[PDB]
Amino acid sequence: GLNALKKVFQPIHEAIKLINNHVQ
C-alpha cells in the first residue's frame, strides 16, 4: 500500500523511472 507506488502507478512515472534505471 505504498502511496508512492499507487501515485506513480496511475501516471507514466512508473514507466519513466523504470526504463530510466533499466537503460543502465
Side-chain angles (χ1 to χ4, degrees), residues 2-8 10-24:
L2 188 52
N3 295 52
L5 285 167
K6 307 304 200 188
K7 273 197 177 190
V8 301
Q10 260 179 265
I12 56 142
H13 199 319
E14 52 188 352
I16 294 143
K17 174 248 139 83
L18 163 52
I19 190 174
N20 268 4
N21 281 256
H22 185 91
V23 68
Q24 257 56 253

